[PDB]
Ligand binder design. Structure first.
Ligand code: 8LS
Length: 1707
């Protein structure tokens, strides 16, 4: 709050723009002599004599500069004067440079030396260059020069393998981007700018004197932005300015962070390569054709001074004026006795035969070409332009007239250059004005030829009055100033939208970086600042604050910004966002805001477009009036009663452009080009505004108008026109025929050529008809709540793709509109990529509905580009059954906050009293019911309400009742399980001294834990594979207490297992008539009742609380971003995250959740760098660094150290548990204020914050090549993490999401959450399971089974969700019967079960196998299919890799390249792999694990999850193979189990199992067996005594095994009878501990196969699996063959070790 004054901006601004001279006088060099011809004044400035060399300064041949840089300098034998003075600065230092040189001094090669300096760091030895490690930006003022430079740099740098490209009218694949100031500004406004600019190490500003021009502010804004980004990102980016020699250049050096003593170089006019004789003509008085004829006379007089060979280049201001000036000279040169006729003295045909042979060509070229004359212009002569260029370059063409576009576009200097008149038509000023300084400079800069001329000459013809300006300009006296005040509001708004200025103060500091600042300082009077004011305020705080204040008020008026004078804060609006993004001035935005409405007609639309302030200076001149009227008659859209006003003129010009009408009047043509260049940007703007306001009619109109301005055709015309290669009269013929385009789809090419009376085209048209983008639409709708529906939209492309026509992709808009098509209820952008063309695309979202339900909605999918490309699908509500309105939440009573003493135990109270005096309202409200009663209870409540100690109440009561009591607690997540295990081990096993156990993967030890445990922690799957056998396991049958936490996760992925085990627990509870107490905890449910009845809770025992009763009040803020491209959106979220921290939780803890591992580190670093660039560093660090060093010494991660030092940690799955616990501990202690964790870790974090920020809502799924939404469950959890009852009076959450999703989060966060069962899609594994254990003996048993499920309750509540067509009991029974019938059918077809008498069922072999190992039935079905007698190890790996277990193995972003790399690196080459295939991935990763290839952290975690189920899969393969009686594939499967456990291959050293052995040790051992293994032992090779403890611990575990065997009654056996081989296994070591497999993640147990088989016929006769311990008896019984003589083989194989395998043959 500082005193602010409103300025009048128009007063401070420079009106004349580039034409403005701060120049007072002008001092002419040497000969100034004036010659007065009485019709005009002639002022001559002579050439400067060539300067003698300075001290020791000498030219430096290319061989001298470093070796790797010589490429691109071929064709250059010698370095330029300038470039030798600059070579050290450019190549050998990183300093910011300002190079001022005469125009044409070849400042280019200097820039190239800077470029080569940057390129030179990336060499990489045997690699040529690193292309993707950097980017270089070249900003040129003109598009022509952009193309020029792209060419030159492309050629010169081609040897380095570098791409140079043009951005202004694959971006990611280009190293050098050449482009215009406004183009780059456009790019870096987008906010996802950094995706482009993150890699930029170098920026080169060409012709930076452009600062003086009206376009100058854009340069200012650019440099300001980039410099501020250098501070903010800490990444150093080199700036190279290249400028003309003009006053104030040092101020430019200051602007560019150039050291005046180091990188600042100024060369006066004496350094011009060709010394220049200058002639300045100006015209005395004002009369008309007399004036113009004077001008043409001048031109004549001046040409003739060159008669024989000299080349003259004439510059004229119009594409017409080339002809007219060559006309006026040919009229006055050849009219009086043919003056100077035959400029070419080759009238005997020297070069005449070359130019007479080239005459064949069009326009005025053919006329002038036989003489020395030619023309080059912007009137589009195409190829003829290039030939004119070539012919002038070879010095054939003598006199060439052209437009400035030549001076900028290609390099062709002449000996003498004449510029005629210096008057040009400016469309935006709407007037005729004095030509831009840059144009004059570049043009006169073409005078004299570097190798062909000792002296150049140039002549500038102009009007006399007030044009002393040009003498100032070309003689280095015209000062460079700042125009920033003109454009300040748009610039400021741009900076506000990017988030770089959040208020007035920030804005003032931003102004500090502008060229305007330096200029205002050093020339205060010019900018209207009193020396007194400047004295009292040297840093110009007052002026900057005032300017900012004024611009702010202007933006606030026009509603681009909400701005309050008090705080001085800025709030971005949508209009401002769009305004910055589409580059439209703010008055325009206000106008659109005023006139835009849903019912706006098309006429009105065109008029609105006409009032755009970009056009405010356009007027209708008299001489064009007539033509306008003609145009008006030919354009289709009525221009309403606006007569010819500027408005109407603009309107009609745009229409005329879409109609492709030809124009004559040249000012009218200019105006047209100007309105049509703008038209697309402005219209795309309007489209965005109305699209996001949801206005359907106007969205449709505007989008269409965009496509029409783009494709230059009306909707009325034929879509085929959009193909440019098609003959226009063919199309006009088609249009003349009256009939729909659609019909062409159903016609053969014959009928096509037939209907059009032009059969020749009949085929080609057909082709194009089927090249036209076309989509099919399928919809599946499921209701969610009475207000909300879920839509699955399937998009199927129907058409042929053509890279030429469709490019790499095609964009569409999905529009969900209401019944009247007046409102867009939901919209989103859909991008169909060419590589993934032909895959069907599933797009899921929710849409709102209102209980007076309409008949239907509509889904349109419209092309973003193509005219008349659309598909509309009605979505019918006629049969829709909305689910039942859900009941009110349980009212929260305000009880006296019941004290810890209310628990009656002192030992119990000691667990609590230290932490809190009293229980919270929820905990006291439930306290009686859960602690005092034994009945089942459901508690709903927002995460962080402390639902945990209600469960604990239940547990304390269970222990109160019976000391030996047993309780099972299930959590959906293993992470949560482990946290609960720590917490409750301490709370129960330590203090109360009970037993607390945690269930693991393996069955036996888990059974044990079930036996000893008072408190059992488990995930649903573990408890499932346990309690499936509950009939046979008593410990499952008796448990006093069953607690399920997070039961709403029933509605999520893996929810079905939860549902199954809970329902099984209720079934058991009712079957043993000793009730199993059931405590269910959940987030607030919209429907608690269904879950209650399901689990047996009374309405009174049911506490379901609204999310607003949450103990710590939640302040939720949701921030929409309209961006479709995820990466871009992510990048534009970066700064708003920081602002969120500094607004809502400046001093308090902050958690930030991000989508991926990489984004944790990245966002951490963003927060860091931004923080330190606020001149607040360690502001997030609340201790001293010193204190932290002892902990940080324990860290491996460099970046994590560095960020933690600044008070920001991060958490991802790559970090060690030690590191994670460290970062968590620091964050809890308050040492670091900010932690950034990945979304995966939201369940595995014990920690809490004052502020939780959710950065985006989506993650990438590589399998489907698309982004998918966060489960609402994960988001509920994340929001839960901002809860601090002790420290905070409020929790605070800021969710950042794509705009389309915004409303969603406002709903199901504030309101309670509806859940459904997905069990009906999981039925098979569970039904098979209950058939094996005979809980289901028949179809009726399955129907009965289904009545215990949550599914059963939900089906009548929300029928349409489960695809029930009614809620009647008939519909329920019918649907359930259909479901069990289908499920059982599938299970029979998969050979898992047998069906008998249509009612009864029985378990089969494959079914039993699947149920036993807990494997999906399709996996073992697939096994049964793909296994045979000849199957081997490689095939086995392929087969287990295809398991359904590995389907959910993730494919991450850009992992296809890394997997593609892996594919060629592995022993077994894979056949036609798709690298988004998870099974291909798990295959390669399995080969990687076998070969001991170490990989990135992601691939390692993946390998862990694979190896988890690898064992059970292989054992299943054993069972299946043995049941078919195959020997060779078996035992190979066993060997595969072994070599998977010990991570080794088939043929390999058996010694690799011993720790610390490498491929070097093995080499000296053979010169092999673990059995062959003190002095002689350790003296074999290199040894340390810790490896000795480990190896000795290995050999005392590693199996020592002897086997005895007898075939009972050898002789008493003959054909057909039973044969019993009794085997005896004994080991001479006492077993202590598990298997040792360092590379195998989990802790396994030895297991062994005793096998009997005939090795000849390849038959497996008998098999048995067991576990040894000390000694074991093994009975193998099998049936006997005939003729009493048979030879068998007895195998003994492990599942763990190689080499322990034994063989005994017998008979
Ligand atoms: C992409 C999208 C667009 C829109 C949405 C929601 C989405 N979703 C859906 C979605 C579903 N589920 C499953 C689920 C399970 C239990 C309870 C609720 C949902 C998630 O877990 C996460 C998820 N994320 C989304 O973003 O709402 C629309 C909308 N907004 C307000 C009112 C009505 C309405 F339809 C606005 C358009």
């Amino acid at each position: 709050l500082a005193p602010r004054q409103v300025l009048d901006l128009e007063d401070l601004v420079f009106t004349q723009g580039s034409h403005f001279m701060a120049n007072k006088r002008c001092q002419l060099p040497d000969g100034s002599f004036r010659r007065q011809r009485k019709g005009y004044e002639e002022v001559h400035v002579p050439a400067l004599k060539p300067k003698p060399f300075g001290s020791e300064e000498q030219l430096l041949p290319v061989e001298k500069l470093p070796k790797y840089a010589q490429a691109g300098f071929e064709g250059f034998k010698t370095l330029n004067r300038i470039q030798s003075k600059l070579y050290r600065a450019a190549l050998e230092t990183d300093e910011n440079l300002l190079l001022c040189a005469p125009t044409g001094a070849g400042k280019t090669n200097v820039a190239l030396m800077c470029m080569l300096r940057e390129i030179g760091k990336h060499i990489n030895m045997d690699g040529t260059i690193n292309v993707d490690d950097f980017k270089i930006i070249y900003i040129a003022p003109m598009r022509s020069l952009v193309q020029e430079m792209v060419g030159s740099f492309g050629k010169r740098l081609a040897t380095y393998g570098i791409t140079v490209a043009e951005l202004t009218g694959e971006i990611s694949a280009t190293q050098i981007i050449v482009c215009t100031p406004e183009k780059w500004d456009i790019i870096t406004r987008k906010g996802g700018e950094r995706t482009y600019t993150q890699l930029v190490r170098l920026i080169i500003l060409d012709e930076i004197h452009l600062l003086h021009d009206d376009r100058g502010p854009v340069l200012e804004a650019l440099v300001a932005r980039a410099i501020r980004n250098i501070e903010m990102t800490q990444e150093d980016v080199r700036l190279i300015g290249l400028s003309a020699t003009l006053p104030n250049y040092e101020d430019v050096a200051t602007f560019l962070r150039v050291d005046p003593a180091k990188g600042l170089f100024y060369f006066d006019n004496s350094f011009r390569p060709v010394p220049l004789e200058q002639t300045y003509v100006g015209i005395t008085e004002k009369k008309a054709i007399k004036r113009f004829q004077i001008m043409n006379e001048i031109v004549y007089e001046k040409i003739m001074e060159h008669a024989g060979k000299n080349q003259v280049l004439v510059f004229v201001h119009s594409r017409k004026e080339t002809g007219k000036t060559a006309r006026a000279i040919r009229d006055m040169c050849l009219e009086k006795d043919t003056l100077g006729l035959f400029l070419r003295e080759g009238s005997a045909s020297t070069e005449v035969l070359r130019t007479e042979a080239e005459q064949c060509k069009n326009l005025e070229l053919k006329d002038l070409l036989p003489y020395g004359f030619a023309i080059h212009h912007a009137g589009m002569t195409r190829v003829d332009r290039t030939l004119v260029e070539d012919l002038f370059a070879d010095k054939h063409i003598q006199v060439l007239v052209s437009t400035a576009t030549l001076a900028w576009g290609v390099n062709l200097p002449a000996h003498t250059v004449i510029i005629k008149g210096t008057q040009v038509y400016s469309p935006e000023k709407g007037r005729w004005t004095e030509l831009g300084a840059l144009d004059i400079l570049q043009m006169l800069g073409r005078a004299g030829r570097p190798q062909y001329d000792t002296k150049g000459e140039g002549i500038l013809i102009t009007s006399h009055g007030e044009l002393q300006y040009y003498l100032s300009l070309l003689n280095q006296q015209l000062p460079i100033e700042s125009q920033m005040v003109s454009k300040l509001p748009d610039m400021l708004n741009a900076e506000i939208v990017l988030g770089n200025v959040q208020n007035a103060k920030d804005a003032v500091n931003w102004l500090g970086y502008a060229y305007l600042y330096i200029r205002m300082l050093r020339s205060p009077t010019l900018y209207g600042i009193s020396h007194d004011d400047l004295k009292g305020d040297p840093l110009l705080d007052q002026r900057r604050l005032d300017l900012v204040h004024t611009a702010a008020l202007m933006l606030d008026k026009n509603n681009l910004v909400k701005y309050d004078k008090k705080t001085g804060n800025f709030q971005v609006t949508e209009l401002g966002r769009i305004a910055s993004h589409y580059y439209i001035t703010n008055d325009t935005v206000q106008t659109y805001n005023q006139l835009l409405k849903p019912t706006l007609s098309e006429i009105e639309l065109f008029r609105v477009f006409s009032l755009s302030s970009e056009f405010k200076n356009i007027t209708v001149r008299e001489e064009e009036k007539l033509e306008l009227q003609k145009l008006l008659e030919r354009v289709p859209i009525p221009v309403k009663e606006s007569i010819e006003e500027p408005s109407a003129k603009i309107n009609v010009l745009l229409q005329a452009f879409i109609s492709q009408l030809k124009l004559e009047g040249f000012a009218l043509m200019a105006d047209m080009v100007y309105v049509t260049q703008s038209a697309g940007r402005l219209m795309r703007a309007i489209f965005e505004i109305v699209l996001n306001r949801g206005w359907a009619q106007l969205t449709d109109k505007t989008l269409n108008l965009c496509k029409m301005i783009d494709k230059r055709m009306w909707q009325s015309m034929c879509p085929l026109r959009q193909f440019r290669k098609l003959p226009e009269e063919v199309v006009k013929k088609i249009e003349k025929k009256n009939f729909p385009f659609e019909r062409l789809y159903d016609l053969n090419h014959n009928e096509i050529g037939e209907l059009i009376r032009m059969p020749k085209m009949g085929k080609t048209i057909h082709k194009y008809v089927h090249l036209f983008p076309k989509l099919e639409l399928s919809v599946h709708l499921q209701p969610i709540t009475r207000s909300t529906l879920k839509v699955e939209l399937t998009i199927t492309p129907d058409f042929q793709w053509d890279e030429k026509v469709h490019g790499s992709s095609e964009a569409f808009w999905i529009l969900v509109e209401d019944v009247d098509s007046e409102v867009i209820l939901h919209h989103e952008y859909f991008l169909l990529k060419a590589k993934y063309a032909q895959d069907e695309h599933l797009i899921t979202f929710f849409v709102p509905v209102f209980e007076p339900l309409p008949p239907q909605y509509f889904i349109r999918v419209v092309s973003d580009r193509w005219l008349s490309c659309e598909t509309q699908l009605p979505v019918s509500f006629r049969h829709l059954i909305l689910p039942e309105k859900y009941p009110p939440p349980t009212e929260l009573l305000d009880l006296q906050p019941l004290p810890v003493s209310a628990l009656r135990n002192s030992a119990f109270e000691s667990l609590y009293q230290d932490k809190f005096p009293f229980f919270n309202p929820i905990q006291t409200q439930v306290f009686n019911t859960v602690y005092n009663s034994d009945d089942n209870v459901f508690v709903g409540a927002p995460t962080g309400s402390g639902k945990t100690i209600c469960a604990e109440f239940a547990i304390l009561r269970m222990l109160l009742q019976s000391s030996e009591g047993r309780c099972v607690y299930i959590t959906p997540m293993e992470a949560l399980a482990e946290q609960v295990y720590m917490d409750w081990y301490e709370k129960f096993q330590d203090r109360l001294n009970k037993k607390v156990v945690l269930l693991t993967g393996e069955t036996s030890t888990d059974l044990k834990l079930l036996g000893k445990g008072n408190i059992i922690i488990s995930t649903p799957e573990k408890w499932d594979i346990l309690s499936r056998r509950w009939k046979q396991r008593k410990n499952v049958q008796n448990i006093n207490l069953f607690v399920v936490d997070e039961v709403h996760l029933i509605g999520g992925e893996n929810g079905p297992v939860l549902e199954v085990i809970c329902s099984r627990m209720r079934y058991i509870s009712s079957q043993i008539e000793r009730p199993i107490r059931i405590v269910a905890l959940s987030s607030s449910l919209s429907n608690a009742k269904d879950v209650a009845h399901w689990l047996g809770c009374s309405a009174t025992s049911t506490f379901n609380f609204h999310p607003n009763v949450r103990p710590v009040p939640l302040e939720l803020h949701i921030q929409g971003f309209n961006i479709s491209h995820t990466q871009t959106r992510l990048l534009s979220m970066a700064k708003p995250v920081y602002h969120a921290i500094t607004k809502h939780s400046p001093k308090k803890p902050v958690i930030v959740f991000v989508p991926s591992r990489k984004q944790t580190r990245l966002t951490a670093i963003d927060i860091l760098t931004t923080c330190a660039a606020d001149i607040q560093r360690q502001r997030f660090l609340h201790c001293t660094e010193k204190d932290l060093i002892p902990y940080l010494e324990k860290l491996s991660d460099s970046t994590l150290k560095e960020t933690l030092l600044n008070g920001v940690g991060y958490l991802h799955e790559g970090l060690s548990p030690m590191e994670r616990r460290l970062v968590e501990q620091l964050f809890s202690s308050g040492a670091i204020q900010v932690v950034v964790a990945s979304r995966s870790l939201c369940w595995g974090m014990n920690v809490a914050a004052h502020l939780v920020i959710i950065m985006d809502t989506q993650y990438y799924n590589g399998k489907i090549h698309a982004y998918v939404d966060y489960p609402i469950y994960d988001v509920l959890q994340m929001v839960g993490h901002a809860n601090r009852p002790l420290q905070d009076d409020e929790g605070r959450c800021v969710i950042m999401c794509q705009g389309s999703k915004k409303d969603f989060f406002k709903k199901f966060l504030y309101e309670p959450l509806p859940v459904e069962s997905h069990l009906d899609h999981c039925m098979h594994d569970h039904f098979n399971a209950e058939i094996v254990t005979k809980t289901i003996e028949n179809k009726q048993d399955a129907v009965d089974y289904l009545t215990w499920t949550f599914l059963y309750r939900r089906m009548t509540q929300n029928p349409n969700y489960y695809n029930l067509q009614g809620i009647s009991h008939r519909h329920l029974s019918d649907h359930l019967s259909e479901l069990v019938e289908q499920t059982l059918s599938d299970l029979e077809q998969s050979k898992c079960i047998s069906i008998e008498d249509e009612m009864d069922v029985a378990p089969l072999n494959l079914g039993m196998i699947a149920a036993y190992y807990y494997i999906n039935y399709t996996t073992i079905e697939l096994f049964s299919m793909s296994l045979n007698a000849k199957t081997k190890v490689r095939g086995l790996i392929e087969i287990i890799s295809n398991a359904a277990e590995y389907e959910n193995i993730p494919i991450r972003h850009h992992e296809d390249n890394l997997l593609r790399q892996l594919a060629q690196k592995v022993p077994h080459k894979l056949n036609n792999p798709k690298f988004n295939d998870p099974h291909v991935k798990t295959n390669l990763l399995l080969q990687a694990h076998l070969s001991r290839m170490q990989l990135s952290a992601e691939l390692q975690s993946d390998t862990e999850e694979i190896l988890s189920k690898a064992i059970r899969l292989i054992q299943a393969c054993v069972d299946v193979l043995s049941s078919n009686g195959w020997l060779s594939p078996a035992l190979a499967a066993m060997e595969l189990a072994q070599m998977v456990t010990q991570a080794m291959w088939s043929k390999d050293s058996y010694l690799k199992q011993l720790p610390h052995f490498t491929s070097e040790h093995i080499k000296r051992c053979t010169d092999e067996s673990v059995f062959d293994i003190d002095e002689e032992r350790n003296a074999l090779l290199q040894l340390t005594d810790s490896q000795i403890a480990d190896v000795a611990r290995f050999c005392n575990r590693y199996p020592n095994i002897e086997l005895s065997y007898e075939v009972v009654d050898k002789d008493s056996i003959r054909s057909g009878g039973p044969v019993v081989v009794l085997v005896q296994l004994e080991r001479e070591e006492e077993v202590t501990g598990p298997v040792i497999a360092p590379l195998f993640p989990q802790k396994r147990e030895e297991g062994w196969w005793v096998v009997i088989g005939d090795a000849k016929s390849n038959s497996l006769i008998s098999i048995k699996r067991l576990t040894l311990q000390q000694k074991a008896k093994v009975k193998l019984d099998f049936v006997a063959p005939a003729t009493g003589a048979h030879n068998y083989t007895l195998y003994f194989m492990s599942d763990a070790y190689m080499g322990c395998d034994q063989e005994y043959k017998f008979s």
